[PDB]
C-alpha cells in the first residue's frame, strides 16, 4: 500500500508520502513500524535528494519537508563537490527562497519553527561548503535584508547562531584543520559588520522574540570574539540592566554574563576592572529589585518549580560562582564594594540550601575555592566570618555518607577548612545539633546519621586536647541518646553512629588504651546481635579501627598481661560463633593486619599459626576424610566448609602478603592435591550429566574451591618478597596441578582464574622460569584462542584474562614466543589483530599494547633472521589491520593507541630500521628502498579501501603522514583530517599541508 513512494520509476505521489510520514509520527503499532521502514529506505535512496524541491513546493506536511531537508543535508555534507555547479546554485537558490518565503508569512513563521530552524541549518551546511569563496556577499546581504523585516532579522540571528556553533563549537571533529581555520578567519574578518547589527537590534529593542534570538547568537559569539567588542561598547550596561528586568531576556542574559566573566581580559587595566565590577553591581541590583531579595527562601522557590525558576536559580548559581571564582579579589579591598561582595555570597548561601544534588555540587566547588583561599591568602577570613558560619550549618545539615565518595570527599575538604578557620564555631554548631537530637526537636534516623558523618569528617583538624574534650562530649551525649530511646530499631541506629564516630577518631583511641579495649570488647558483644546490619557494622568498625590502631594490639600495654592480639585469638571461636562466613573472613583479615605489625619473625609465625588454628584443624580433618573417600567431598556441607577454609586463608593472606608464607607452606601440598581431586569430580559430573552440570549448585561449589585456591596462590605470589621459594617450592607443583586440567577440560569447565593466576606468576617470576612460561603458552594459548575467536561476546572473562596473559608474557619472557612453531606464532599475530577489532576496551587496549611491545621486542633483536622473517611476514598485516580500525568508524575509543602503533610502524621504515626488502623478488626494481615501497603499498591499499578519494588526496595524505611520523600530536591531526575526507567526496588535498 504505502511502499509506492519507494518506486522511483513514476513521479512521486506527494499525498502518498504525506500519509506514510503522518502514520509514522501520529500513527501507532504495526502501521507506524511499516511506515518507519518505508521512510528509512526512502531517504537512504541515493537519488532521493532529486525529489526534494518537489516535496518543499507541493507537500503541505511540515514533517515531509523536514525529512526532505535531512535528505538534502546528507547530500550537501557528503556529495556536494561531485555535483555540477548549476545543481549547487539551484539547491542554494531554493533553500534561500524557501526561508524568505516562510519569514514573509507571519502564520508560517509563528507555527513552523521546527521546519524554519531546519532550513537555516541546511543553509549553514551550504555556507560551510561555499562561503565566503563562492558567496562573498552573504553577510553584507544578510545585514541589509535584516532592516526590511523583523521576522527576517530574527531568522538571520538564528542562521548566524548556527554558523557560529558549526565553525567554533563543533568544527574540531567534523572538518579538516585547514577548513576550520579558513571558516574561523572568514567569520572573524566580517564579525565587525555582524556585531554592529547585533548591538543595533539590542539598543533599538524592537521585539522580545527578536531580542531573545539576538542574545542567543551573542552567547555563541562570546565563546570566541575578542573582549574589546564587550568592553569598548555600551553592551555590558544593556546586558546587566535593561535585559535583566524582563524575564524573557533574563534567562539568556545571565548565560551571556556568565560567558562574559570567562572572556580573556588584560589584568593590569584599572578602567576594565571597574567595568567588571560595574556589570556585577548592576546584575545583583536587578536581581534584588526585580526577582527576589537576599533573604528569599530559594529552597522553597526551587522546590515549588514554577515556570523557569529552577533553570533561573541554576543559571544564577553558575553566574555567581564563575564571576566570584575569577573576580572576587576586585570586591575585597574597596569598602564601598563590601556589601556587593557579601550579598553575592549571601545569594550563594541561599542557593546552597536548595534540595538538588547536582546544583549543590556546583556551589560546593565554589565554597572549596573560597575556603581554600581564606586558609592561605592573608587578611581575608575576617571579611567572610558570617558567610563561613552559615556555610558550616549548610555543609553539616546536608552531609552524605562516605559511600558517596566524591560528594563526601568534597564536603569533608570544605568542612575541614571551615574547622581550621573557626574550631569554636564548628564545635558549637555540632554540639547544638546534638542537643536538638536529644530533646527530640530534630530527632530522626536520617538526622542523627547526617550529624554522625559530619562530626566524623573533621577528625584530625582540632588540637589533640580540644579533640579529646569534643570526642568525649559527643560520645557521652550519643550514649545518653541511646539509653533514652526505646526499641532495637532506635538503639541500633544510635549504636552504629556511636561506633561510626569512634572509628573516625583514631588519634583519641591511640592515646587512651582502656577506652580502645572497651570499644573492641563492645564490638565483640555486637557480633552476637541478630538485628539487621549490626554484625556488619561491628565487623566493618573492627577492621577500620585495626587498620588505623594496629600497633596498640601487637605491643603489651603497661597494665596488661599480654598483647591484646593474643586475647582476640584465644576467644576467636566464641567471638565469631554467630557471624556469617564473610563476616568471619573480615575478622580474620583484621587479625592478619595486627600480626603483620609484629617484626619478630618467631613471634609473627607463632601468632599466625595461633590465628589459623580453627581453619587448620578443620583442614587436617577434611584432607584425612577427603583422601580416604572421594565420595565424601561431593556432599554440599563439606564443599562449603572447604571453600570457607580457603577463603579464611585468602583473607589473612590479603593483609599479611609476604608474611603469610609459613601458613601457605603448611597447606600447599594437600591444597594442590585437593585442587586435582575437585577437578576430577567436576569432569566426572560433566560426563554423567552434560554441560548443564556446570550450572548445578554442587559443581559451582566445587569450582569455587578451585577459584579460591587460585586466588590464594595469586594473592601470595603477587606480594611475595622471597621469589627463590616461589620458583623452587610453589611454581612447579602449581603448573602441574592447573595447566593440564585447564587444557583437557571442555571450554565451559575451564576457569578463567587459571589465566589470571598465570599472569601474576609470569609478572613476578617470569624472568626465572623460561621453560615454565613455554609450558603455560603450550597449555592455555591455542585452546583459549579457539574459545574466543568465533565472535566478540562468548567467554568474556577468558577473553580479557587471555590478553592480559599474552601482554605480560610479551613484556617479561618474549623468548617464549621465539620458541613457538611458525604456525602457532602466526596464530599469535592473528590473536593480536583479533584484539584490535574488539569494542570491549580491556581487550582493545591490551591488543594495541601487545602489538606495540611486540614491534619493539623485534626491533631490539637487531639484524637477525627471525626479525627479518617477522617483517617480511607480518609488517604489512600490522600496518593494514591498524589502518582498518583507524578508518572503519567502529573503534574510535582506541584512536590514540592506533595512531601510536601506526606511527611506530611507519617510523621503522623512515629510519631504515628494517634491513630486508619488504617486497617480493621482481615486484619492483632491484634497488628500491622500503620508503618508496611503503608509499606504493599504502597508496594502493587506500585506493581500494576508499575508491572515491583522488590519487592526489591519497599521495598528499601519505607525504604528510610519513614526514610527521616523529611528532605524535601532528600525526594524529593528519589522521583526523583523513577521517573527515573519507566521509565526503572532493576533499582538498592541500588540507594535509596544515602542519
Amino acid at each position: 500500500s504505502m511502499e509506492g513512494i519507494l518506486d522511483f520509476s513514476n513521479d512521486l505521489d506527494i499525498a502518498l508520502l504525506d500519509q506514510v510520514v503522518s502514520t509514522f509520527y501520529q500513527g501507532s503499532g504495526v502501521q507506524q513500524k511499516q511506515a518507519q521502514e518505508i521512510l528509512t529506505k526512502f531517504q537512504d535512496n541515493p537519488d532521493a535528494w532529486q525529489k526534494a524541491d518537489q516535496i518543499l513546493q507541493f507537500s503541505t506536511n511540515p514533517q515531509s519537508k523536514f525529512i526532505a531537508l535531512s535528505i538534502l543535508d546528507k547530500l550537501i555534507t557528503r556529495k556536494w563537490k561531485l555535483l555540477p555547479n548549476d545543481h549547487r546554485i539551484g539547491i542554494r537558490n531554493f533553500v534561500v527562497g524557501m526561508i524568505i518565503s516562510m519569514c514573509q508569512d507571519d502564520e508560517v513563521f509563528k507555527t513552523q519553527k521546527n521546519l524554519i530552524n531546519k532550513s537555516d541549518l541546511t543553509l549553514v551546511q551550504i555556507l560551510k561548503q561555499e562561503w565566503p569563496q563562492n558567496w562573498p556577499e552573504f553577510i553584507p546581504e544578510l545585514i541589509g535584508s535584516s532592516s526590511s523585516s523583523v521576522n527576517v532579522c530574527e531568522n538571520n540571528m538564528i542562521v548566524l547562531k548556527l554558523l557560529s556553533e558549526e565553525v567554533f563549537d563543533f568544527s574540531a571533529e567534523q572538518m579538516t584543520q585547514a577548513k576550520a581555520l579558513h571558516l574561523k578567519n572568514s567569520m572573524s574578518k566580517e564579525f565587525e559588520q555582524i556585531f554592529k547589527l547585533c548591538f543595533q537590534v539590542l539598543e533599538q529593542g524592537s521585539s522580545s522574540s527578536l531580542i531573545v534570538a539576538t542574545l542567543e547568537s551573542l552567547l555563541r559569539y562570546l565563546h570566541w570574539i575578542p573582549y574589546r567588542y564587550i568592553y569598548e561598547t555600551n553592551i555590558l550596561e544593556l546586558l546587566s540592566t535593561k535585559f535583566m528586568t524582563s524575564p524573557d531576556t533574563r534567562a539568556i542574559t545571565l548565560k551571556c554574563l556568565t560567558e562574559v566573566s570567562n572572556l580573556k581580559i588584560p589584568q593590569d587595566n584599572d578602567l576594565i576592572k571597574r567595568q567588571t565590577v560595574l556589570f556585577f553591581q548592576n546584575t545583583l541590583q536587578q536581581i534584588a529589585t526585580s526577582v527576589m531579595p537576599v533573604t528569599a527562601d530559594l529552597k522553597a522557590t526551587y522546590a515549588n518549580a514554577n515556570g523557569n525558576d529552577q533553570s533561573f536559580l541554576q543559571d544564577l548559581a553558575m553566574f555567581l560562582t564563575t564571576y566570584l571564582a575569577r573576580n572576587r579579589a576586585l570586591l575585597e579591598s574597596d569598602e564601598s564594594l563590601r556589601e556587593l561582595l557579601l550579598n553575592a555570597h549571601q545569594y550563594l548561601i541561599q542557593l546552597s540550601k536548595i534540595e538538588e544534588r547536582e546544583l549543590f555540587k556546583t556551589t560546593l566547588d565554589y565554597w572549596h575555592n573560597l575556603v581554600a583561599d581564606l586558609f592561605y591568602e592573608p587578611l581575608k577570613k575576617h571579611i567572610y566570618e558570617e558567610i563561613c558560619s552559615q556555610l558550616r550549618l549548610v555543609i553539616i545539615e546536608n552531609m552524605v555518607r562516605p559511600e558517596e565518595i566524591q560528594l563526601y570527599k568534597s564536603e569533608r575538604e570544605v568542612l575541614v577548612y571551615l574547622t581550621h578557620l573557626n574550631v569554636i564555631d564548628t564545635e558549637e554548631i555540632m554540639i547544638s545539633k546534638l542537643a536538638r537530637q536529644i530533646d527530640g526537636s530534630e530527632w530522626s534516623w536520617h538526622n542523627i546519621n547526617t550529624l554522625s558523618w559530619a562530626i566524623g569528617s573533621i577528625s584530625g583538624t582540632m588540637s589533640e586536647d580540644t579533640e579529646k574534650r569534643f570526642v568525649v562530649t559527643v560520645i557521652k551525649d550519643l550514649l545518653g541518646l541511646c539509653e533514652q530511646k526505646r526499641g532495637k530499631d532506635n538503639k541500633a541506629v544510635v549504636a552504629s553512629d556511636i561506633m561510626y564516630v569512634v572509628g573516625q577518631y583514631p588519634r583519641f583511641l591511640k592515646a587512651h588504651w582502656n577506652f580502645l579495649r572497651t570499644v573492641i570488647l563492645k564490638l565483640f558483644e555486637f557480633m552476637h546481635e541478630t538485628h539487621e546490619g549490626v554484625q556488619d557494622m561491628a565487623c566493618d568498625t573492627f577492621i577500620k579501627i585495626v587498620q588505623k590502631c594496629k600497633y596498640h594490639f601487637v605491643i603489651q600495654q603497661p597494665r596488661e598481661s599480654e598483647p591484646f592480639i593474643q586475647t582476640i585469638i584465644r576467644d576467636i571461636q566464641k567471638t565469631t560463633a554467630d557471624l556469617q562466613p564473610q563476616q568471619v573472613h573480615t575478622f580474620y583479615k583484621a587479625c592478619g593486619i595486627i600480626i603483620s605489625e609484629e617484626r619478630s619473625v618467631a613471634e609473627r609465625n607463632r601468632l599466625l599459626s595461633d590465628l589459623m588454628q580453627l581453619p587448620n584443624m578443620a583442614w587436617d580433618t577434611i584432607v584425612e576424610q577427603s583422601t580416604a573417600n572421594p565420595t565424601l567431598l561431593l556432599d554440599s556441607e563439606t564443599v562449603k566448609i572447604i571453600a570457607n577454609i580457603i577463603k579464611t586463608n585468602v583473607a589473612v593472606c590479603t593483609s599479611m602478603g609476604a608474611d603469610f608464607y609459613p601458613q601457605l607452606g603448611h597447606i600447599y601440598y594437600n591444597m594442590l592435591q585437593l585442587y586435582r581431586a575437585v577437578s576430577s569430580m567436576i569432569s566426572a559430573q560433566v560426563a554423567a550429566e552434560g554441560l548443564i552440570a556446570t550450572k548445578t549448585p554442587k559443581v559451582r561449589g566445587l569450582r569455587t574451591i578451585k577459584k579460591e585456591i587460585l586466588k590464594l596462590v595469586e594473592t601470595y605470589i603477587s606480594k611475595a618478597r622471597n621469589l627463590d621459594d616461589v620458583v623452587k617450592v610453589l611454581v612447579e607443583p602449581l603448573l602441574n596441578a592447573v595447566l593440564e586440567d585447564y587444557m583437557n577440560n571442555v571450554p565451559d569447565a575451564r576457569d578463567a582464574e587459571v589465566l589470571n593466576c598465570m599472569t601474576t606468576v609470569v609478572e613476578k617470576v617470569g624472568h626465572m622460569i623460561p621453560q615454565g612460561v613455554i609450558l603455560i603458552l603450550q597449555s592455555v594459548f591455542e585452546c583459549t584462542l579457539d574459545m574466543i575467536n568465533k565472535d566478540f561476546t562468548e567467554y568474556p572473562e577468558h577473553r580479557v584474562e587471555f590478553y592480559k596473559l599474552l601482554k605480560v608474557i610479551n613484556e617479561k619472557s618474549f623468548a617464549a614466543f621465539l620458541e613457538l612453531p611458525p604456525a602457532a606464532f602466526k596464530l599469535f599475530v592473528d590473536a593480536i589483530c583479533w584484539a584490535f577489532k574488539h569494542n570491549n576496551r580491556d581487550v582493545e587496549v591490551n591488543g594495541l599494547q601487545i602489538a606495540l611491545d611486540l614491534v619493539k621486542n623485534i626491533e631490539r633483536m637487531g639484524n637477525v633472521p627471525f626479525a627479518n622473517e617477522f617483517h617480511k611476514n607480518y609488517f604489512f598485516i600490522f600496518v593494514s589491520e591498524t589502518f582498518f580500525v583507524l578508518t572503519d568508524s567502529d573503534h574510535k575509543s582506541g584512536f590514540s593507541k592506533q595512531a601510536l602503533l601506526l606511527m611506530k610502524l611507519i617510523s621503522l621504515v623512515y629510519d631504515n630500521k628494517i634491513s630486508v626488502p619488504l617486497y617480493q623478488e621482481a615486484e619492483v626494481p632491484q634497488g628500491t628502498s622500503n620508503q618508496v615501497y611503503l608509499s606504493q603499498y599504502l597508496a594502493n591499499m587506500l585506493s581500494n579501501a576508499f575508491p572515491h578519494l583522488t590519487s592526489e588526496q591519497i599521495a598528499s595524505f601519505l607525504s604528510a603522514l610519513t614526514k610527521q611520523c616523529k611528532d605524535l600530536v601532528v600525526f594524529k591531526g593528519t589522521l583526523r583530517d583523513f577521517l573527515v575526507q573519507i566521509k565526503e567526496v572532493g576533499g582538498d588535498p592541500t588540507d594535509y599541508l596544515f602542519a
Binding site: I475, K476, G487, K488, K491, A492, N514, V519, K522
Partner: peptide
C-alpha cells in the same frame, strides 16, 4: 582524668535491647 573513666563506665553499658 576521672572523666575518661566516666566515658569507659558509660560505654560499657551501651546496649541494643527491645523495650
Amino acid at each position: 582524668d576521672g572523666y575518661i573513666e566516666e566515658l569507659i563506665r558509660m560505654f560499657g553499658k551501651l546496649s541494643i535491647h527491645d523495650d
